[PDB]
Every structure is written in C-alpha cells, then in structure tokens.
Amino acid sequence: MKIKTIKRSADDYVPVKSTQESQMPRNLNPELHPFERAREYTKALNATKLERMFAKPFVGQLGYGHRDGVYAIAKNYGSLNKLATGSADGVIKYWNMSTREEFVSFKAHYGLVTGLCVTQPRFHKSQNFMLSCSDDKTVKLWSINVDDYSNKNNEEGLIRTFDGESAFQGIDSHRENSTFATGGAKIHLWDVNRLKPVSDLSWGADNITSLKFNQNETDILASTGSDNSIVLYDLRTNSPTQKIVQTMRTNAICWNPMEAFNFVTANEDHNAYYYDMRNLSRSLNVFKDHVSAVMDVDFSPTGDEIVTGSYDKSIRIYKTNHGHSREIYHTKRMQHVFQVKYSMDSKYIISGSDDGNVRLWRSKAWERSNVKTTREKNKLEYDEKLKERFRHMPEIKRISRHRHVPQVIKKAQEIKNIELSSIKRREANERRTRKDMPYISERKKQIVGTVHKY
Amino acid sequence: NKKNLKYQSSAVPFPFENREQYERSLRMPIGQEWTSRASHQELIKPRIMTKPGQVIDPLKAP
Amino acid sequence: VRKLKHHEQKLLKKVDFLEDYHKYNRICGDIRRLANKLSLLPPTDPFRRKHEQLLLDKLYAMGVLTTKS
Amino acid sequence: KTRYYLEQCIPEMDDLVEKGLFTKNEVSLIMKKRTDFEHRLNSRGSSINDYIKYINYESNVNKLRAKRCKRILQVKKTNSLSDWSIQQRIGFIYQRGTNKFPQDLKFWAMYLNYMKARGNQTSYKKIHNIYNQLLKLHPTNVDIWISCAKYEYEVHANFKSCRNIFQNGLRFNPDVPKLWYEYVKFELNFITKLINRRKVMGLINGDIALTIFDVCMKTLGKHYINKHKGYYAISDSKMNIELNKETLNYLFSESLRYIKLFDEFLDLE
Amino acid sequence: PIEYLLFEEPTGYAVFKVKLQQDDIGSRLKEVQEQINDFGAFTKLIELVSFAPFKGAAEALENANDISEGLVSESLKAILDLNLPKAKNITLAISDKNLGPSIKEEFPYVDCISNELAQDLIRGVRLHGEKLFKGLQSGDLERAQLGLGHAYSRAKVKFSVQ
Amino acid sequence: RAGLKKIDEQYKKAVSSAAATDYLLPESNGYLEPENELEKTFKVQQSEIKSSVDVSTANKALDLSLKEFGPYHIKYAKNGTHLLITGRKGHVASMDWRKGQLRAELFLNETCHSATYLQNEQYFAVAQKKYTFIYDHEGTELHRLKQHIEARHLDFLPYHYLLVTAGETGWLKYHDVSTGQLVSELRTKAGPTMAMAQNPWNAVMHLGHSNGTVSLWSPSMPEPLVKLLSARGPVNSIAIDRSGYYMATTGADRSMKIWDIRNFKQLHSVESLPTPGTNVSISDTGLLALSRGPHVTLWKDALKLSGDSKPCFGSMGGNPHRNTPYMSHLFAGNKVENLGFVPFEDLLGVGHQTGITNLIVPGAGEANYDALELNPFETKKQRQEQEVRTLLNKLPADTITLDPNSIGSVDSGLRSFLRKKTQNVIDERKLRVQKQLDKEKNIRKRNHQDVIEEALSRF
RNA sequence: UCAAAGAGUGCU
Secondary structure, three states: OEEEOOOOOHHHHOOOOOOOOOOOOOOOOHHHOOOHHHHHHHHHHHHHHHHHHOOOOEEEEOOOOOOOOEEEEEEOOOOOOEEEEEEOOOEEEEEEOOOOEEEEEEEOOOOOEEEEEEEOOOOOOOEEEEEEEEOOOEEEEEEEEOOOOOOOOOOOEEEEEEEOOOOOOEEEEOOOOOOEEEEOOOEEEEOOOOOOOOEEEOOOOOOEEEEEEOOOOOOEEEEEEOOOEEEEEEOOOOEEEEEEEEOOOEEEEEEOOOOOOEEEEEEOOOOEEEEEOOOOOOOOEEEOOOOOOEEEEEEOOOOOEEEEEEOOOOEEEEEOOOOOEEEEEOOOOOOOEEEEEEOOOOOEEEEEEOOOOEEEEEOOOOOOOOOOOHHHHHHHHHHHHHHHHOOOOHHHHHHHHOOOOOHHHHHHHHHHHHHHHHHHHHHHHHOOOOOOOOOOOOOOOOEEEEOOOO | OOOOHHHOEOOOOOOOOOHHHHHHHHHOOOOOOOOOHHHHHHHOOOOOOOOOOOOOOOOOOO | OOOOOHHHHHHOOOOOOOOOOHHHHHHHHHHHHHHHHHHHOOOOOHHHHHHHHHHHHHHHOOOOOOOOO | OHHHHHHHOHHHHHHHHHHOOOOHHHHHHHHHHHHHHHHHHHOOOOOHHHHHHHHHHHHHHHHHHHHHHHHHHOOOOOOOOHHHHHHHHHHHHHHHHHHHOOOOHHHHHHHHHHHHHOOOOOOHHHHHHHHHHHHHHOOOOHHHHHHHHHHHHHOOOOHHHHHHHHHHHHHHOOOOHHHHHHHHHHHHHHHHHHHHHHHHHHHHOOHHHHHHHHHHHHHHHHHHHHOOOOOOOOOOHHHHHHHHHHHHHHHHHHHHHHHHHHHOOOOOO | OOOEEEEEOOOEEEEEEEOOOOOOOOOOOHHHHHHHHOHHHHHHHEEEEEEEEOOOHHHHHHHHHHHHOOOOOHHHHHHHHHHOOOOOOEEEEOOOOOHHHHHHHHOOOEEEEOOHHHHHHHHHHHHHHHHHHOOOOOOOHHHHHHHHHHHHHHHHHOOOOO | OHHHHHHHHHHHHHHHHHHHHHHHOOOOOOEEEOOOOOOOOOOOOHHHHHHHOOHHHHHHOOEEEOOOOOOEEEEEOOOOOEEEEEEOOOOEEEEEOOOOEEEEEEOOOOOEEEEEEOOOOOOEEEEEOOEEEEEOOOOOEEEEEOOOOOEEEEEEEOOOOEEEEEEOOOEEEEEEOOOOEEEEEEEOOOOOOOEEEEEOOOOEEEEEOOOOEEEEEOOOOOOOOOEEEOOOOOEEEEEEOOOOOEEEEEEOOOOEEEEEOOOOEEEEEEOOOOOOOOEEEEOOOOOEEEEEOOEEEEEOOOOOOOHHHOEOOOOOOOOOOOEOOOEEEEOOOOOEEEEEEOOOOOEEEEEEOOEEEEEEOOOOOOOOOOOOOOOOOOOHHHHHHHHHHHHHOOOOHHHOOOOHHHOOOEOOOHHHHHHHHHHHHHHHHHHHHHHHHHHHHHHHHHHHOOHHHHHOOOO
8 A cells, every 4th residue: 555654864864974964953843842931031041140150341450550540531533442541640641452551651731630632633643642631721732653553664742732821621622623622711612723712612601611522413512511501512603502500510421422412411419311402401311320429421332322430439331211220330449430431342441530540341241352153142142132031020130130239339329219218208298288289300300491492 | 820920020121112012022932943043043133233343433424 | 961061060050860888877877866865854764774774785785885885 | 054054945945836846845855965965065074076066966956947947837937036046056055165175276167167158147247256366366377367368358358458467467477488478379369350350441441479578588587597596596607607508498499489379370470 | 444464474475354353452351362372263353365375495585585674575566466455545464564664665555554463363373374274285384484494594694505 | 003013023924934944844754545445544454564664664663572570661762762661560671772772671570660761861760669769871770769659650841850750649749850859749639640641732740530530730839720520430541642732531431532731622522432441642743542452543633623533433334524543453362551652753652561562653753853852863972961951941840830821921125125115106107197198098089079957057 | 892971182
C-alpha cells in the first residue's frame, strides 16, 4: 500500500567531516517552545543581576592631576584624545588622555584660572591652541605641539595676550570663526587678530559668571549672571535678546548638540533645568536627584543624555526625557565636583574636583571597550531590550535601581524628603479653607520673571 | 486563581503610551527560539548607536 | 555536571545535587542525645542513675571506653 | 550565521512554488543541498572547491527554472524575484570565495568570465571594480594586467584606459619583457587602426612604439644587471665584463623578437 | 581617523585597510590590548589589501637601506599610489615619523600617522605575520629576515670577500 | 491608533517570518492512506508495514522478550534517544535503543512500579516500594528520598527542574533536582492517585482518583486550581495532547472522555468499549493511542471539535462520519502495561510482561525537531552546556500559572515609660485628625448632592 | 575499548 515513514539521512545530520559544522535544525512551531513569557522574564532577571556585577565605571585618572583644585576643563571638539585642564594654582595642562600623560604643562596666570577653551585660531595639524582667562585681568592664547601627524619635521609657548580692564570669569570660542567671548564684569566679544575687545555686549551693570556659545546655530550665545539671571545673545544682531531672572543662581550651561533650540542649566537649588529657547516662561524638564548645588552640566554628543556635577561628591547622569538619575558615580577620594564633561565619542566621562585629580568614568559601567564578535554583540543587544521590556518588574526594579550611595548623600535625601512632605502637608491643610490658590506648576515655580512677555 | 503580585508591572513601561499597548508587546516574543534570525536583528536593534573611535560631530545645517 | 564558568557560578550555586561512617555517626549522635535527655531529668530521681550507669557499663563492656568513665 | 544565508533563500523558494515551477517537495530538496553546502562553506577546512561545487549547483538550478518557465508558464521571463535571484546569488557566492581565498587566480578567472558573459546583467563598472581589487592584490602578475587592458580594448575599445593599464604595469614590473612586448604590440595595434581608418576616411570622401622599444632595453638591461649580481657588486673586472655580455646577449635577443613583431605589420614603414 | 596602514616585510610591502578604529580613548585598558594579541579580534580591525613582493634579493637591500634612512623607493612609491585614494586627506599609518615627510612630499594628499594608536596596529600586524596574508605567497619571513640581516648589516661595514 | 497599528504590524511580520521558517523545515511526517477505498488503515497488519519500511527502520523497531521481572514499564526520554524500562519485580536498565549499548543495569529485587529520566540520560530515578531512589549515570545510587514514600508515579518538569510523586497517602511531594530540596508537600484530599499526568503547555499536574474527579495541581498554589470528574469510575490514566489544548482520560467503567483544557469542555464520550483501557497516550501529531487488555487501537485526527472526528470502533456500515481506528493491533496472550510514543521518531512503544516492543506508525512522530530544545544527535560536549544553559534558565516554582501568557501583566527605666506615653498621645492625635478630614470629606458630598414648624424653624 | 571527568593546543 502507500507508506512513508520519517527517515533520517545520517550524512545530513552528522557531517562526514570531523571539521564540518553539524547541521543545526530549527523548527519555529510555538508548541516546541513553551513558557514564552516566563523564560524571557528569567533571562531579563538574569541580565539585570549580571549588569550589577559588571558595573565597573572607573577606568583611571589623568597623570598626577593638578596642584590646586581643578576648576576649568575643555575638550577638543575635533580630536578625541585631548583635553585642556586648569587649576586655581594658575597652571594649565594639555593632556594626551590615551596615554594618560600630559603633552605640556604651563604656568599661565598669577591668579586663578577662571575659564579655559580650546580653539583653532584663524591667524590673518602639528599644533593645537587653547585660550585661558583668569582673574589677573588677562587672556592668553597658547600653542602646544601635538603628535597626531608626522607630516613635518615648534614655537610652543605663549602666542598672544589680551589685557582687560576687569577680571575675566568665563571664556568660550565661536565654532566656525576665530572670534571668542569672555565673561568679565562685562561680556566682551573678542577677535584673535585684535588685542582689544571687538564688541561690547551688556544688558546692564550686572556681571557675567559663565557663558557658552552655540554649536548648531553658532551665532547665538548664552550667559549667566550673579543676579540670578540667564541672558541670551545673537551675534548676527550684535545685541542681547532675552533674559529670565531665576530664583537661584545658575552655575553652568550646556546646549543640546542635537536640538539647536534646547539647553540645560546647572542650578544652585540642587536642580538642573532643561529649557526651550523660544518659550522660556517654563522649562522643558527638571532634574532633582542632587542634594547639593549643581556645579557643571554637559550634553552628550548623542544629545540623549546629560551629566551633572554637584557639590555633594557625586556625578549623576540623566536621560533627557526622564526626570531622575539612572546612575551615581562617587568615591571617597573625590572631594567636590566642579566640572563634568563627556568624551565626545560619548563612551566616557571626564571629571574634575578640588583634590586636583582629573578622572575618567565610563558612561556605561557594564559595557566594555573591546571589539566584540558578531555573536557577542547580539546577546548584549538581547539583554538591553529584554531589560527594556521588563523595566518595571518588581524584582528587576529592586536589583537594577539599587546603588551603593555614600552615607552622607542618603542622609541628606531622607532629611530632604521629610521637609517636602512637611511642606506638602502644610499647603494641603491650608487648601481646605482659603478659596483662591493658583496651582503652581513644578516647571514654573523656579522662574521669577521674564523681561519680554509672550 | 488570584493573580500573584510579584509578577505585576508597577506601571506601563516606556515608550508605550497606553496599558493595552504593553500586553500586545508582551504577546510578541523577542527571543530567537520563537523568531527568525533576520527578524531578531530588527526587533533586537537598539534605538541609539555609534561607532567606536570616531567623532560624533553634532548635526550640520539640515 | 561540567565545571561552571565564573559568571555561571555566581548566577547559580549549590546545583551539585543529583569510607562512609554514617551508621557510626548515628550511634555516636544517638548516644549524645540520650545523655542529654538523662541530664534534663532531675538530679535526685533514681531511674536515670541506674540507666546512665547502665549506659556506662554497657559501653565499657565493648572497649569503646578503655576505662570506666 | 548559517541561518542568515538560508533565510535570504526563502523568498525565492516561495516565488518558485507560487509560480508553479517547482513543487514544495522539489523545492525542499533544493534547500537541503543549499543547506549542506552553506555549512561546508562556513566551516573549518573549507576549500575553494566547495565554492566551485556550490557555484555549479545553482547554475544547474538556473537552467532548470528557465526550462520549466517555458514548459509550464510558456513565458520567456516571469516578472518576479525568481528570475534574478539565482544570478544575484552566484555573484554573492563568488565574492566570499575570492575574499576567503584571494590566492587562487583560477577562481578570480571564473568570476570575471561568468560576469563578462552576463554583460547586460552586470555593468562594466563592476567588472572594473573586480579587476581593481584583483590587480590590487597581485600587482606583479603580468597576466592579470594584460587581461584587464584586454577587456577594455575589445569590449569597450578605450585606448586611453588600455594605455593606462600597460602604462601603469611597466612601472610595477619593468623586468618582464613580455609586458613590454604586449605594450608595443598594443601601441602598433592602435596606430594601424587609425591609418586604416584614415584610409577608409579617404575612400568615403610608429616612432611612439620605437620609444617604448628604446626604453625597453634600458630598463631590462638594468634589471638583468641587478640579477646575476645579487646583493653586492662584482669585484672582478672579468666578471663585470661577462655580466655585461649576458646583459648584451639578453638585450640582443629581446630586440630580435621586436624585429619579428614588426614583420606582421604591413601598413607601417 | 586611521583608514590605511602601511606594513613592510622582507618578502614585500603590505598595505592594510582599517575597517574598525579601536577605541582610542581606552587604548591602555587590558581588554582592547588583549584584542591585539587575539587573532580573531584583530582580523576585525584590519584586513590585507595589497601585497607587492620585492623582485629579488638586490632590490630588497636597496629598499632596506632607503627605509632605514626614511626614504621612499620607486617600489614603495608604486604600491602607495596604486592604493591610496587621491581624495579630505587620506590618513595612513606608518611606523616611522621620519618616513612621513618623504611620503608627504611624494603624495600631497596623504596624512601620515605614527602615534601610539598606529604603533598598536603595527605591532599586531607584525604579531600575526603571515596569518593575516590569508595564504598570499609571502615566503617565510623568519628566513627572509635572516638573509636581509647579513645583507643589510654587511653593507654598512664594507666587508669584502677580499 | 497608529502606535497600536505599528505594534500589530510588527506581530504580523513575526508570523510572516514564522511562515518563512516553515519552508525551511527539512522533512514531513508519515502518512498511511490506501490506494483503493476497499483497503482500510485498520485492516493493514503490522507484518505488512514492517516489510514496507527500510531495514534501518526495521532495526529501529526493537522487540526484546524477557520474563524474569515482568511486567516492565517503558519510558522514553524527551529527546527519545535513551530508553528506560523498569520491571515490576524490580529490574531497571538504562540503555539507548539506537546505539545498542546498555548504559547501566540494576538487579535490585524490590518491586518497582515506575521509573524515569530526570534532566538527561545521565541522571534518572527509579521508584522502589515505599521509597524513591535516584540512580546516577554510572548506576550508583546518589541518594534516597525519605520524603517521597510509596509512590507509583514519577513526573519531572524540564523547565522548572522539579519532580512530582503521587501515592495512596494522598501526599504530593514536589522536589527540585537542582536545589536538592523539596518545594512543598500537599495532600489532595481526593484519596489515592491512580492516574498522574503533566500538561506541557502550563506545567500543571493532572491526577485521577476514586471518585473520578481530576484535580489540577501547582507547586506555588495551595488548593486545586480546578476539579473536574470526567468518568464515574476511577481514572486509571490521564493523557494530555502536546499542544495542551486537548485532554483525554480512561475511566474504570469503560467510558472514554475527550476534554479541552483551555475551555474545560468535554469533546467526545465513548462507552462502546469492550473493557476499560489499561493506558492512554497522545502523539505529538495529535493521534491518540488506547490499549485495552491485549488490543491496541489508534485513531487519526481524533483531537478535533467536529463530531465526525469522534473516535468510533470499527464502523457502522462504513459510515463516513464514523471515524475508524487508524490502526488496530492485537498481541495474543499478552497485556499492555503502558504506552509510550517514541519522541522525534515515527514509532509507538508498548510494554508487556513478555517484553518490550516498538510498533512503527506513520505520522506518529514529529516531522521536524528543533535542535535548540532537544537533539538526538547531541554530542556529549553539547549536552553538558545544554544542562548548564538550562540550569541558567531554570524557571522558579512560583512562576507556575494556569496560563503562561497571563504572567508579566500590569496591575531606660522611667525614661522608656515616659517615652511610650509621648508616642501614644501622638498616635491618637493622628487618628482623630483623619476623622476631621473624613468628616469634612463627607460634608462636601452632602453639599454637592406643618406650617408651624416652618414658622418655628428659626428657634 | 567503551565509559564518565579534568587540563592545554589549533582554528571560526
């Protein structure tokens, strides 16, 4: 009669070769693969634990560091391995962080180094240039020999000095052109080939503490004042544009490299505020996981992540759309964070504290910098999404969210939470009787007023 | 038959905007035991990427 | 099973399931429990003192105790 | 990544069944042979023969699909993925074998010949690309460079490009008289066609090689001196005279071929 | 920013293409360093593209002297131009900084690299040797080195069979 | 709406990808259909089929006759490579039928009622009378379980690494091999467990008792998820189809019931049986195998909703609606102790007192096996990772649920005394203030929602 | 020999 029975060809399943890979039969019938959801959860729950034992953020420090506290850090936006660092001792250093050594070490100013920026001056490959400003009322342009290219073979040292009537407290350079701006008692626009300030910008008599040029719409500049104010400028008009007066002072700014109109501000109220340029009556987001004043803030070149340095001996790194830190970096030997900045490959975090040490941190503690096989990348890629799928699982939250935070910060937070609850009960009690209370949005409490209403 | 609290999401995970969206994804399996090799590379693929050792130069004028 | 790798050891532990003196260990322990129970009983009642003495004599007859104890 | 290659074969398998050219059981048998080969190719001990054994296989499958297209569908070409799926695969087999084994000049040869045959399907630019890499891996093999110079002077008749090849070759391997011999042959290949074209032009209405000939001796003599001398100069005067003699006899014999080469050219003086 | 690598052997000149650029930030960390030793990882970094054997013994010494003095030989000028794109400027890794100016003079469109990142790759190209050639006929390097050693050494002394 | 649409499209792409892999599947199952309508699948004799199949398939069909400790219960490893047969009077041998090499032999003279492999061929358990014994690959006993006493039924969960036992004591022992600890002890209160079964889809145990009620059991859960009685008589055996949708039973009163686990509904009932079924088995293909005394009858396409699919003995005048036995086989002068399908193989096992024999059945085995789950061709080195990776992915007992999909959803001195008075008076004040808030919360709801007395309402 | 367990080498 007609009969067929399941028949295995031995050669097909067992190769005749000792070296040929055995055929790897797969059938995607769901009945073959039961317990779909449970297995993914266990793989998720296993991935989360492994992330913790592999969370290894510290890689090393830059040489022997500075003598006095580090108070100025600048990255070369065109070269990976290069930083310009300065300390209040008056010494400025230019680093080869790939070898974790110094290219050159220079005693720039008698007083405190209050600003540092790296530039490509266009005077009217083998050398790099950096600009330093200090409270001794001078700005000095310096040149350093670099070993990126061997197409030639010197003149390493001071190139030009700009004398100022008043002390300088901030400096940044326009990306396209050689012009750079200094923040002193007055915000001044400078040209490399001119010793005197080319243009005088100033809304009023208040000083400027910090300033940062735009990267995308590079003609725009923002500055911070000691009167708890943020000022916007545009070079195409050569005039200020806007201010908003804040409740507290803002120490640092960083503008988003992926959104030209968006920026974050490091604030004195243990908060960092995300802003939209056009409508500044409110903030885009608020970051509130620090317990002391935020000293510096930097955007990743990816534009999706932000890192904040605070006075509470910790570095917090936040997702742009999430209002709470996903990670904490801390150490006993770290005394006060004043500068936090990103390796522009987005894989590492460069930090500077008053102990004089400049440190490298990993943006991803669990990731590793070696080149990985096609197989390897897939499984690591597997765990990330599987963790992403099961983020809010109760067990995964406990293992993932758990961090070893120092005793001092946790005590501040639990004290911090008590007052907020103590406040919150108070207006809630008041709300029972007094008829006319406007609810104050969390995004608008920290604005005091805006000059230009809209 | 009461459902165990241990295996319950505290809230709807991002980027999903509604509760019903979350169960639909849970129905869809990511594992290769249930998905083809090519179909894995699309579901597994992370949103943000990069290339080691290169400048991520910020956006030019569009 | 095959020796687990380092990470496998951390993830899973004590998975290695599935001259012997266990009988003698049971005897040594079984004697120890009996001595403990005799101690729990008061110091004056005569029953255990006959019994503990009987246990001393019973063990001594073997050689487990080289001398009276 | 064996499954990745198998999965790219699924869409054409579905097309074959959809068009009715191959039944599911027949399509299943084809995949079994494809699966076995792919494991052979991706495994250790894989040799270039495995590529050649595979490359012949889909070639036969290509013929059967064409015959069954006329036998069942009665259509020269059915507008679906099946028509160009095999040919795209064939090139996709070749490039791995060439990359895996750049040594085998034989395998390069089928890859060009298979591709030159299907001129409509494969643009001449891609053939130039393959030669670029093939020349680029093996600059010292004259047989390659005259091969690419050849493809561009018959199929394309681009003397400018063909000149550049023979031009560039003499730089890399100035020691080989054969490449000198062909370049002069090409140079007189070129002149006669112009003069014949000029003769045709009138009907409807050279020294350059000698410079190549002249410069041929200077290089070949210098190179023949470098060999038979080794690392070091020859101290004895009599040998230095003798080394001249072999260079001379070598440089007479080369000239004597060129006397023969001119004979075939009737038009030129 | 490295794309092409020039390696130089007793059997010939070998040019490489850098598919992937190793993390220049973390160059000194162990894991990337182990990749240099590991052949599987290193093959993912670069892949051989040119090999031009020297014609014979005499030409090798002439190049061995030229490379020692940081000069570009005719054979060297041949392999680079066939390979480096004219192109902003193509970036090439060379073990010698002294050879850099010579290459720049011949080819204005190429920028040379001799930083530690280049040295890391040059070390690993050398570490695997004939393994990276994928079977291309490179003779045997260890023997060829020993012959050029007597040849390169003896030349400077002007020793003679006399 | 668009986000919901994109999620659906991604799912529709996944099934399309699954459809793509369906073409990749190497082989198909067997068939057995007659050329001529007169020819019947039940009429064909096994002696004819054995001639039809290949000599290798004839070698695969294994029949050994031995009477020393009969009867022998046969069990097939999940991968199907290694065969365990346990004699009633106490002989158990571990061996691979394809290899032809006996792995380990035990001549213990104690009545053993059942035996099984646990996680691989290497480690297996044999149920001795009044205790449970685990025997190593070498054949040495690694341990004896005092908690597991006097059990005939041995179950193991490949994903949860747990062994289940059933006894007349009524106590269900749940033991995990990896942790080497007993998860839980539960008394059914349904009396002795004559039938035991496992459902692969939800890993929920199935038991039969004298009343005939079937109680579903889970490690996590204290009391039975569902209780259902298919037959008036005790259920001597429980079978559950591979998909887990369909569940089939044999009552001691000769009456058959086909059920569906998901909807808990009775598909088909048969009372025309000459004698109660000794055993029941369901193929991975869905074919059901029923052994009654010396006769074994198999029905194709039984697990279907349609009434015409209903199994029926022989036929009533060749009625198309009547479903004849796909095969009918009789062993004269013999009895079937148990039935076992040969996984990944086109065969059915049958166990007897005379011996163990394999019956070749086209379509009985799965056409194509996924190797990631199980490989008959696994070398020794792959298997040791297979257990390692399966150890790494062990499923906790608590994750057991009625439905796997439901999981993951979204829902001093005087000072101390004087201190105690202060924390008190604080506590009452808190308890009073919430009344004032609660009372005020009541007032807002109330506000939100004789002529003489009106004259006098003001006073 | 099989049979179970280690420790290195080659290579994707």
